[PDB]
Structure formats: C-alpha cells, structure tokens
Paper text:
The temperate phage lambda, which infects the bacterium Escherichia coli, belongs to Siphoviridae. The tail, which comprises the tail tube and tail tip, connects with the head through the neck. The neck–tail complex comprises a channel formed by stacked 12-fold and hexameric rings and a 3-fold symmetrical tip.
Each of the 32 rings of gpV is assembled by 6 copies of the major tail protein gpV wrapped around an oligomer of the tape measure protein gpH. The gpVN domain comprises a β-sandwich flanked by an α-helix. The β-sandwich is inserted by an E-loop (residues 50–78) between β3 and β4 and by an O-loop (residues 24–38) between β1 and β2. Six copies of the β-sandwich form the core of the tail tube ring. The architecture of gpVN is structurally conserved across the phage tails.
Numbering used by the authors:
A (entry chain G), B (entry chain L), C (entry chain H), D (entry chain K), E (entry chain I), F (entry chain J), ...: 3 to 156
The structure:
Amino acid sequence: VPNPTMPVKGAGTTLWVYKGSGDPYANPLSDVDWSRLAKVKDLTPGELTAESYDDSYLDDEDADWTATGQGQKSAGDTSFTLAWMPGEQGQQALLAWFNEGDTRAYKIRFPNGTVDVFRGWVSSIGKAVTAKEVITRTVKVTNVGRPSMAEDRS
Amino acid sequence: VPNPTMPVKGAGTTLWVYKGSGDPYANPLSDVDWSRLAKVKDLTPGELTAESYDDSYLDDEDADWTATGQGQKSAGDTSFTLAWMPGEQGQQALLAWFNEGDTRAYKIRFPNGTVDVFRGWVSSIGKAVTAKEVITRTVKVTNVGRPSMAEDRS
Amino acid sequence: VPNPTMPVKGAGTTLWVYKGSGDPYANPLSDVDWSRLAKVKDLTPGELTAESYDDSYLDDEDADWTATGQGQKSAGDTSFTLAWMPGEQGQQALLAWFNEGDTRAYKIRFPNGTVDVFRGWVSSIGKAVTAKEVITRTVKVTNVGRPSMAEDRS
Amino acid sequence: VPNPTMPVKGAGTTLWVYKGSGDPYANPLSDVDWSRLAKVKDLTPGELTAESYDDSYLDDEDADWTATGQGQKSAGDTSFTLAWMPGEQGQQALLAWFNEGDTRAYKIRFPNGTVDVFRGWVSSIGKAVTAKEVITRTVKVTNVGRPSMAEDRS
Amino acid sequence: VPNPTMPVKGAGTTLWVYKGSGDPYANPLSDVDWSRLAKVKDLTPGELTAESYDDSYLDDEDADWTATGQGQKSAGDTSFTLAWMPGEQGQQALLAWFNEGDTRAYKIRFPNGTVDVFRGWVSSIGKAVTAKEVITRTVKVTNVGRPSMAEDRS
Amino acid sequence: VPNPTMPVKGAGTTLWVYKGSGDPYANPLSDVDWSRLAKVKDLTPGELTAESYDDSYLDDEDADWTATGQGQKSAGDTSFTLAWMPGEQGQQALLAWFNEGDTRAYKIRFPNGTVDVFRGWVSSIGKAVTAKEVITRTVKVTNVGRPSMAEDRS
Amino acid sequence: VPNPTMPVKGAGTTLWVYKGSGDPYANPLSDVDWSRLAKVKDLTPGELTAESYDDSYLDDEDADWTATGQGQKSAGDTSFTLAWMPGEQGQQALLAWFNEGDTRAYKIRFPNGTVDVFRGWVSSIGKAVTAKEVITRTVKVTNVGRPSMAEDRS
Amino acid sequence: VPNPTMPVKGAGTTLWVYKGSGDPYANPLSDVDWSRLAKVKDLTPGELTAESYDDSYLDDEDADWTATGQGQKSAGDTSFTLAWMPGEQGQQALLAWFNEGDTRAYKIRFPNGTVDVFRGWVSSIGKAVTAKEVITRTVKVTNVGRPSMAEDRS
Amino acid sequence: VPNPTMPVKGAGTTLWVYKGSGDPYANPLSDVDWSRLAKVKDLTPGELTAESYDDSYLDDEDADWTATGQGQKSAGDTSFTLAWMPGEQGQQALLAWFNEGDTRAYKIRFPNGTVDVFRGWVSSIGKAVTAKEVITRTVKVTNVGRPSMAEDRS
Amino acid sequence: VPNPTMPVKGAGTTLWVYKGSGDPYANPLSDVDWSRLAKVKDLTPGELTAESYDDSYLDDEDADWTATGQGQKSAGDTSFTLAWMPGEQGQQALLAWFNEGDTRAYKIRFPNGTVDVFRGWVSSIGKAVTAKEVITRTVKVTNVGRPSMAEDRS
Amino acid sequence: VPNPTMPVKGAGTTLWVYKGSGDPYANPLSDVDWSRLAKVKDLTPGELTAESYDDSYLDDEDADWTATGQGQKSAGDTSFTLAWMPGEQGQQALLAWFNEGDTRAYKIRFPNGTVDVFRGWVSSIGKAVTAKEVITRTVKVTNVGRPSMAEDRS
Amino acid sequence: VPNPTMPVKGAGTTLWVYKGSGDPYANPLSDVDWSRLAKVKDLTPGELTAESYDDSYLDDEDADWTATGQGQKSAGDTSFTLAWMPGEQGQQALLAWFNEGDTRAYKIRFPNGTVDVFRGWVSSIGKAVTAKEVITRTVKVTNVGRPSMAEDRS
C-alpha cells in the first residue's frame, strides 16, 4: 500500500503529457485526457533554484559579514531518455511539440501515490546509435512559470 | 520483420549520400541515385536544439518566477568515423564535398525500416593512425535548414 | 559519554529548523520550538570564508613581497540530501520556506554534545529518481549574517 | 600486396621531410631528395577544418531554423613523438628548421601505398625524461596553405 | 639523530601558533609562548611564487626570443586539516583568529630539526561530516609579507 | 659506451647550476665552477614554442585556406622536484637564487653524453609533506633568451 | 501588503493616459476615465532640475567663495519603450496625441501603492526592428508645469 | 496568422520603392507598381520628432516652472544596409535616385500585416569591403513632409 | 575605536539634514535637531575647487613661463542616491526643500569620528525604475558659501 | 565565375593608380597604363553624400512639418592602409603624388567583375611602427568631381 | 644601489611639502624643513608643454609647408590621491594651503636618487567614499613659474 | 639581409638627434655627429597632412558636385616614450632642447635599411609613475618645414 510518510523506491514512475483544454493544475490525479510516454529508461526531474539579490547600503552600521536576500526563482530543465518508437503516438506528439514552439503541461506520477505537474517547452531532441544497444531518444524540456509540486496537495 | 512500434537494436544502420538533381525529401525510401558510404564504425546523429527567448515586461503583475519562450531552432552536428579506403568512390566524394564548399543531403537508414534525411556541409576531416588498429577517417558534418525526421512519414 | 576535547565520529548528527518567535542564538541547547528534518543521508556544513583586500601604496619602501589584509567574511552554502517523504510535516515546511522567500535559523546538533546555529534562505530544491534506490530530496541553503559556531559556547 | 580499396592496419607508416628545390606536390611517390625521420613512436596527422559563416537577412521569409555556409578552411597541427637521437642528421634538420623560421613540406607514407603531403612550420619542440623509458623528442608542426591529400591521386 | 643533510620522512611534523608579544623571527627554535595545534591529519605548506615582468623595448636588436625578468614575489596559501575538538584551546584560538581579522605568526617544525615560520591571516574555515569517519576541521591560511624559510639559519 | 646516434634510457641524468664569471655557452662539457643539485626525483625540461603571426591581405587572389608565419619563439618552464636537504649547499643556492631576482645558467647532462644549457630565473619554490614519504622540494624555473640545445654541438 | 515606508522592487509598474474632462490632480488614485498603455518594457521617469542664478554684488564684503540661489525649476523628459501593437486603442491614442500638438496628463502607478502624475506633450516616436526580437515603439514625452509627485499625498 | 493586436518578431520585414505615377498614400496595401529592394541586412526606420517652442510672457503670475508647447514636427532619417548587387534593378534605381535629386515614396511592409509609407530623398551612399564578409551597400534616406504611419489605417 | 590618524574604511557613513534655528557650524558633533536620511546606497561628497586668475604684465622682464594666481574658490555638488520611501519623513523633507527654493545645512558623519558640514540648495531630484532592483531616489545638492571641513576641528 | 547579380565576398579586391594621358572614365575595364598598389591590408571606399537645402516660405499654407530638398552632392574620402615598401615604384608614385599637389584617377577592381573609378588628391600620409607587426603606410585620398560608380556600366 | 643611468621601478617614491623660509631650489637634496605627505596611492606628475607661435610672412618665397616656432612654455597640473587622515599634520597643512591661496614648493623624491621640485598652488580638493575601500583625498595642484627638473643637477 | 622591396617587421628601430653644424639632409645614412636616444618603448612618427582649398566660382557651368584643391601641407607631431634615465647624455640633451626654444633635426632608422629625417621643436615633456612599472619619459615633437622621407633616396 502506497504511503507518503515512508520512503519509497523509484521503480514504477510514469511520465505523461497533457492533451486537451482545461486546467492542468485543477485535478492532476485523474488521467482522463493525459497521453502517456512509454518505456522511459532515465528521468531526472527539474531543479528549482533562485538568484542572490545583494541587500547592502553604505549606511549599514556593520559590513563585516555579507547580507543577501532571495531573488527570482526559476524551475530548471527536466530531461529524460526513452527508447525510440517512431510509430507510437506518443513520440509523434513529442516532435509535433518541438516543431510547433509551444508550452504544454507534463506530469510525473511516482509510486508513492503523489503527482508532480510542470509546464514548459522542449529544448533538445537527440538520439544515440550503438551496435548492441537499443536506440534511445533523449529529450530535455525547459520549464516556465510555477510548478505544482507534489506536497502542495495533502 | 521490421516494426516501428517495438524497440530495435542499432546494428544494421547504413549511411548514404545523395548525388544527382531532384528533391531529397520527396521520396527518401527509394534508393536510386543515393551513393553509399561503407564500413562505418561509429555514428552519432545530430541533436536538434533551441535557444530561449526572454519574454518579460515591467508591467506584468507576477515577476517571482521566470517566463521564457522558444527561440530559433537549429539542427546540430552529425559525426561518424569510417574506415579509411581512399580508392573507394564514397570517400573521394567526401573530399570533393569538403574542398568545394557546398550543402548536400545525406540519409541515415535504420534497421527499424524508417529513413532520416538531413542537409548540411562538412566541417572536419580527420584521421587516426595506430600500430595495431585500422586507419580510420573521422568526419563531422554541420547541418543547415530543417531536417526531415523519420517520424514525419507515417 | 560525550566529550568536546576528544575526537568524535560523525554518526548521530541531527538537523533542525526553527519555528516560532524568539532569539535563536539565545539558548540553542534547548529543543523546544525546533522542528526536525528526519532521515538525512548526507550533510556538508557551510564553509566560512573571506576575500583579500589589497593594502599597498606607492610610498612603501619595500614592494618586493605582496601585502594584503582580510576583507569581507561570508558564510557559505549548507547542502544536505534527505529521503523524500512529501507527507511529513518537515518537508512541507521546507517547501513553504522556499516558496515564501524568507530567512530562518537552522541548527546542526553533533554527537559531540555541541550545537551549531546558522541563519539563511533556501537556494535549491532538487530530486533524483533511480530504479533501485530511494527517492531523495536534495536541498541547498545559503547563509546570511554571522553564524554562531559551536566553539563560542564553552 | 597493398590495396587502396580494402582497409589497412597502421603499422609501417613512415615520415619524411623535403630537402632541395622543386615542386613537392609534383611527384611525391618518388623518394629522391626526401630526408627521413627514423623511429617514430606516435603520429596524429592534421585535422582539416572550416568555420561557419552566418548567412541570414531580415528579408528572409522564414527564420525559425538557422542557415549557415562554409567559411575559411584551414589544415590543423601535425604532432609526432620520436626517439631522441641528437647525432642523427634528421633531428639536426628539425632544429635547424625550428631556429630559422621557415615553411617546408613533410610527407607521410602509409602502408596502403598512398602518399600524403603537407606544408607547414614547426611550433613546438619538447622532451620527456623518465628513469625507465627511452628519452623522446616531441614535435608539433602547424600547416599552411592547401594540403595534397592522398585521395586526390587515383 | 636529526640530520639536515640527509633526507627525512614526513611523519613527526608539528604545527604551532604564536601568542604573546615579541619578534617571531628572532628565535623560532625556542618553544616558549608558542601555542600548539594538535592532531593534524594533513598539511600542505605554502608555495612561494613570482610573476613575470615584461622587459622588452623597440630598440633592441634581437626580438626573435622573449626576454623577461622576475616581478613581485608572494607566498601562497597554507592549508591543513585537523580533527575537530571544539573544547581545546588551539581551535578556540583559531576561531578567535578568524573572527577578528588579524595577522599572526605560525610555525611548522619538521622532524629534520629545522623550523619554518610564516605570517598571515586565515581565509577559510570548513568542516566535513561523515557517518564512519572523524569530524575534521579544514583551515586555509593566506600569508603576507616575507616568510622565514628554514634554509636561512645554518 | 655512450652513443648519440642510438636511443638511450633516461636513468643517470644530472642537474647543475653555474657559479662564477664567464661564458656558460663557451664550454658546457667541462665541469669546473658548476655546482650540482643532488637527488632529483623528477625532471621535465622546457618546451620551446612559437606564436602564429597572421599573414593575410585583402589583395590576395585566394582566401579559401589560411596562411600564417612563425612569430616570437620562447623557451618555456623547466620544472623539477628534488628531495629536501636544507643543509646542502645546492639548495641554499636555490633560495639565494630565488630571493635575489636574477638570471643564471643551469645545465642538464644526459647519459647520452650530450649537454643542454639554459638561462633563466626561478618562479616557484614549493614543498610537499606526507606521513610515509620523503619530503620533496619542487622548483619551477622560467627561461629567457636563447637556449643552447644539445645538437648544436656535433 | 504594500507599504510606503519600506523599499519596494520595481516590477509591477503601470503607465496610464488620461482621457476625458476634469482635474487630473484631484483624484489620481481612481482609475475611472484613465486609458492604459500595456506591455511596457522600459521606463525612466522625468528628472526635476533647476538653474543656478548668480547672486553677487560689488558691495559684498567677501568674494572669495561663490554664492548662488535657485532659479527656474523644470521637469525633464519622461521616456519609455513599449512593444508595437498598432491595433490597440492605446497606441492609436499615442499617435493621435503626437499629430495633434497637445498637452495631456499621464500617470505612473508604482507597486508601492502611490501615484505619480505629470502633464506634458510628446517629443519623439521611434521604432526598432531586429530579426530575432519583438518590434518596439519608443516614446519620449516632455513635461510642462508642475508635476504632482507621489509624496505630496500622505 | 498575422494579428496587429499581439506583438510580432521582426524577421520577415520587406522594403519597397515606388515607381510610376499616382498617389502613394491612396492604397499602399496593393503591391502593383512597387519595386523591391532585396536582401536587406539591417533597417532602422525614421524617428519622428518635434522641437519645443517657448511660451512664456512677463505678465504671467507664475514663473517658477517652465512652460512650453510643441513646435515644428519633422520625420528623421531612415537608414538600411543591403548586400551589394550592382546588376540588380533595385540598386540601379537607387543610384538613379541619388544622382537626380528627387523625392520618391518608399514603403516598409512588416510581418504584422501593416504597411508604413514615407516620402524622402537620399542623403548617403556608402560601402564596406572586408576580406571575409559580403560587400554591403549602406544607404541613408532623409524624409520630407508627413509620413503615413501604419496605424492610421484601421 | 575610531582614530583620525589611521586610515578608515567607508562603511558606516551617515547623512543628515538640519532642521530648526541656530548655527549649524557652532557644534556639529551634537545630534539634536538634525533629521536623518536613511538607507543611502551611494555618496560622492563635493569637490572644492578654484579657477586661475591671470597675473601678467608687459613690464615683466621674463615671459617665457606662465604665471598665475588663485581666483575664486567654490564648493561643488554633492550627489547621493537613496532608496525610495515616500512615506518616510526625511524624503518628504527633501521634496519640501526642493519645492521651496532654500538653502539649508546638511551633514556627513564618517566612521572616522569626524563631521563634515556644508550649506547648499537642491538641484536635481530623479528616479530609476527597474524590474529586479529597488526603486531609488537620486538627489544632487549644490553648495554655496564656505564649507566647514572636518580638518578644521582638532 | 563572377556574377554581378549575386552577392560576393570581399577577398580579391585590387587598387590601381592611373598614369599616362587620356580619359580615365572612357574604358576602365582595360588594364593598360594603370599602375598598381600591392599588398593592401584595409580599404574603405568613399561615401557619397549630400546636404539639405531649406525650402520654405511664409506663404505656405501648412508649416507643421518640415520640407527640404537635396543640395550639393560630394564624394567623401577614400582611405587605405598598405604595407610599407619604399623601394617599390607604386609608393614612390604615391609620395610624388602627395608632394606635387595634383588630382589623378584611382581605380578599385572588385572580385565581382566590376570597376569603380574616382578622381581626387591625397590628404594624409601616415605610418605606424610596432615591435611585432609589419610597418604599414596609411593613406587618405579626398575626391573631387563626379565619381563613376560601377552601377553605371551594365 | 641607486643609479641614475639604469632604469628604475616606481615603487618607493615620496612626496614632500616645504615649510619655512629660504630658497627651495638651493639644496633640495637636504631634507630639513620639508614636511611630508604620507601614504600616497597614486601620483601623476605635471606635464611641461608649449604652444606654437605662427611665424609666417607674405614675403617668403616658399609657402607650401607650414613654419612655426615655440611660444610660451608652461608647467601643467600635478595630481595625487592619498589616504584620508584628517588628524595628520600634512593634510591640515594641505587645507591651510588651499584656504589661503598661496604658492609653495613641493618636492618629489624618486627611488632613483634624484629630486624634482615644483612651485604652485592647489586647484582641487576631493574625496571618494565607498563601502569596502579606504576613504581617499584627491588633490590637484597647479604649478606656476619654472620647475626645477631633476636632470639639471648632475 | 635588409630589402626595401619586401615588408619588414618593426623591431630594431632606433631614434637619433643631430648635434653639430652642417646639412642634416646631405648624408643621413652616415652616423657621425648624431647623438642617440636609447631604450625607446613606443614610437608613432608624424602624419603629413593637407588642407582643402575651395575652388568654386559663380560662373561655373555646373555646381552639383564639389570641387577642391590641395592647400598648405604640414608635417604633424612625432611622439615617443622612452624609459627615464636622467643621467644619460641624450635626455639631458632633450631638456636642453626644450628649455632653449630651438629647431633641430632628428632621425629615424628603420630595420629596412632606410632613413627618415625631420626638423622640429619639442612641445611636451611628461612622466608617468607606477608602483610596478619602469618610470617612462614621454616626449612629443612638433615638426616644421619639409621632411626628407625615406623613399626620396633610391
């Protein structure tokens, strides 16, 4: 039985792409109108980050130690590699996404029972060919706006 | 039997270079008037990519999180290393391609049954000499314009 | 029995986050009004540092050797990785800390019997997903002001 | 029997330096008036390369994908390491070549039966001393002008 | 029996820090008024260095080969890592040294029988926490002025 | 019997420093008035090098391939590491050389039977301390002017 | 919550233009009858200034140091650049303003919660066209009379 | 689909020059009898401006603050640089325009779907010659009379 | 401890404006009846200067070299930029100072322990708005009469 | 093959000076009786220009917008820098041209296949001396009369 | 040992100001009755200059080339910046010098062993305040009459 | 071997000053009675130039294009910077030249093998002092009359 409180191993994660019209953040737990990408081999989700903003004046009584405040936050790049299946409707959606410069919403569903939703556009579409290994399609997606992390809902 | 839906191993890929007059994108599956480069030993196809365009104004109410949109897409470099056979027609075509700065169309044919076509010019011509190994000719080709990915056709 | 004089092994370290209103530096040994982050796997405490300030004049009789003085000190970044438990209260506190840009005080309690207090804001919130390993939450916290090292109290 | 069509292993390569007056490119297959460097232990021939020249205008109807053309070609550096024999005539010729800044023609004769001619000047002259290994002299030669690759003659 | 002429192994080196008023360079061999840092686990002493000053004119007959002269000498950084014992006097002296920027004199005493004295201020104070290893305190000290090498006294 | 024509292993090399007044290049083979540094563990002699000087005009009929000529040659840095013996004469000479910014001549005598002479000034004086290894003194010397390589004499 | 006492970052500023009949200075805080310019990318508000008026007589007892008084004050030029949207009612108002030489009142509304009102006429209407950037309309407005600065109201 | 309300990127702009007899302002959207200049590489359209007319009397009660009104409006200079093709019809038209001092009507057609018309005479004709770049023809045109901005038509 | 003899760093400077009736120069060390401007980011104090007065006659025996004497001294402009807080009393005092043309006395109190007093009137009041930076108020004040430099009191 | 219609790169330009008696404009394509300047390193051809002539009257019904007409055209200055070869005949011709104030015709022959003829007199003759660069002679030539641009002949 | 014939580096220069009654030029080498300014951080000595006097008549046969003769020589300005120490005697002397206009003699003493004397009056007194840098006092002094260069005495 | 026909690098130039009685232009190649300035670091020789003289009449049939003729030629300023050696004869000669307003002849001798002679008087004598650089003496000389350029002799 899935349990948010206890740790969970990573095997079982799925990746989804939104198609349709509506609010992706409204009800991420249901899968109606969410297309799926199958056979993902690697997945490194985006890394939220922030910039230091220098908060110092000449008036300040003491200047021995620095003082800074948080600046402009920004979600990073979410990159995954998945096996090459050009006839699947899923990968045709990826290249239609790339060619038509657009921002859609993609979802990560962990075995924990939680859901993680981002919005972004695709930045790279690569491939690797080796004699004795499956042909892989590597994708990197750049996020915009505010992600809806998993522990907002509780 | 080739099947686009299922994954495929990489062994069996071929590389072809176009000679003649016509439309390379019109009918890549046909093999007429396509010269072939033989005995490739490595192949890393080009990586499509795009650069971010900053979309922010002073008016916008929310400025905590960054907002960006897709910019100018560009295919990358395709580099392959193939055994040195200076008397073969294909490699003389390669150096004729390099000396006379020109853009031609080269094709990658996967065991999957699909076809991948690019257009570009050659950027590097190298060599490696070792006592106990076959002399290899390393080539890097820079693409221009819009590639024709294999999954456009379906 | 804990002993500040003798060396100590690292196992037993704990991490805490301050909640409430008061003076964090006043009495850190008490554990009231301090929330705790559980199941930390790695921890690298911040690195205090300073930058050189050039102290030279044309008058100086001797200029063969350089002469410098200490400049502006600054505590560094504290980064720890801890197992992903989105339903636990501590990690919801972490993301509330991140979303609302703010500076709080976090505490490190060593097995030695001493306490190390910092003040800072959170800079990065990341995650790593692998098939056969526990999903981890990686955090980096940037410090401001003057830390209260353990060596002050004695 | 040497065969340009089939692949060949690297053992048997020789290095030569032109002395005399004439046209090096006219007839490289002959071995008269070509001094030889003996006992070479590594050799990496130069890498021909070119740089991109941006070909874009504001008029262009389509600017989604980049468009570039080939720029200025340039042969690279040829570097080889050969055992230190200061009393041999070839290495005295090398240092006379270095001290008097000048461009000569050096030749690489592969076991394949073909010949590769370059023109250039010497850039580095180094040495390595180790207790249990032969003292080596390392050379790097920078090319100018147009090389005469082996694939021209056929 | 210690002997400067013959080589010596490194085990047995000690590190000392000066407290009091006087001339550190006057009599470093005496051990009075020199506090000691105990249980060091690594030590890389500073590296004296100098920067080139370009000495060339337009008049000079020969300009094929470069000509330079020595510039401004400067001792480097001395960094050592020692086990964390916050209750010991030496490490409280270290943090008092760091907080109040100041230049003091520290001494390295080799098993050879010689003494090495520097003057400088502290630049970094770090820590490393691991589950199965002793907690270590890493210090880096930046020197100023002229060091008193051991090779002066003889 | 030493032989310049044939290769030689590196063991047996010696390093010398000139003291006195005269011409170092006049008679390097004689060993009078040449002080010696003993017990050297590593030695990497300097690397002669040159700068490319761009030789191109707008008039030139062809500009497809680059054309360059040799620029300003310069001997590099000669660095060696030798065991720490502060009571020996040679190393006191090294520190007297470093403190008094000066250019002297140092000699390398190979087992081949040849001699290599440089002129230069010292740039670094470092040390390494390890628990179970001999204390080593590392020196780097920067050369000026024209070296007298070994195969000038024949 | 907006607070005049504390500093505020600049993001969120809006620009407005008055249409109708009434007193612009009477009630700037309400937005009835105030048209808005949207998507402003840069904004540098006007710089109030004054002229020195020479106050000196021959009678004056001392003339060693100058003495001056304030002259005729004048608000400067307020210039902003906003993205080109010729179909918006807002930008048509700008060009109707320019063609019909007139003085109207424009308003700046800061995130602080305050309001800044000027009166003036337009001096420049420019444009910038770049291949990969949004077309921008640059405007400069020259002010007349007395501005109603933000801290008049309190 | 072109849309005046939304912002547009600059790529796709065209420049046209009128030939024939009629009213340029009557129907600029139609493309008949408008010659075209091809391959523009830069374009900075003219900047409308006005000069202040001093409106102050001695009678006025208030003279602390300046008061001015708009004077004589005047379109500025329009300068574009386009690749040198002396055999094309457009550039021969340019030099015929320059030699015979005359005022014609030139049109700028944006990707937005709008049209901008000016009237003026040519002021400069320049050229730039570089070894590795396309020879460019730089033109500056001075406008007279009243321009017809694109947003008059709606 | 403050010390006029030794050099001092700039952090800790304060700016004050005189309100009330009395003699500003009489006792500036006291802080009563002096309003304060808070949060100053930059400060460039005025530059005392003088202009040359030509002292030459036709009689002078020697006229090869020029001869001049000092003319009329004049303090310059003091300009500081401070964060925009329109609800604070100090900045309302600044704009009341500007609107009513008047000369008051403002004071600079250095960390050294000394005081620098000027008298003057305000010349410029400006502002700068940026998306990611604090809104700043820039002021310039022009001095009259004789300043009371800190070096007078001792 | 040269083609006036298509763009061309600049490499291959030549500079010529007319000697003899005849009509320079009659047949510039021929190369007889035209001396040549060799080894030019930069060349910026003259910039044709004209000045505005104010065309306004008090009668004019409308005076809101300015109205001007073209004035007196004038070719600008042609400046080129070429390597210093005082023994060559061309540069002796240049200085004879300068010393005897006179107007001759100089020609620019582009790689395009066209010819550009001017007439003018020389204004500046300069030189630049640097230690590691070729001595250059810089010339500026001022044109008179009507140039014969390449676009006339077709 | 100081040596006028050989070049010297700048470090070690001192600046002195004369107090007392006598002849400054009589014996500048002696240091009695010369006050000293301490801790200078920059120094750019004055630049002697002269202005051309036009020497041409209508009679002269040759008027192609200009002819001029030297006019009125004049020493320039000497400006130095030195650390702000208002309690030191030298800087109180500086402001006493400024307030009471007066010409005194100041001396520059180079490490070369020579002495440079000027006479002049002070023109500017400035200051720079920065958060992390030493407060500096910038002075500019204008010379009168004839300087006594160091090259006179020999 | 020096060669006037071919280009030459700048290193090796010398600067000379004439002392004695005779004709400087008669035999510049001989080096007798020519004093020398040593250790010059920079040298920019004078720039010959001319003034436009307007040649236009009302009678002229055409006035569309300007017509001008050469006016009064004039050699410019020759400036060089050389290291400060006040005890050397040449620099005492420079200051004797400056103090006694006079015109002498100075010579530039290029590595090409040619000679360049000017006549003029000195205009500036400056100096630059830096902590870590050689003290430099900067001189600017203004020329009169007719220079004797290098390619007059052939």
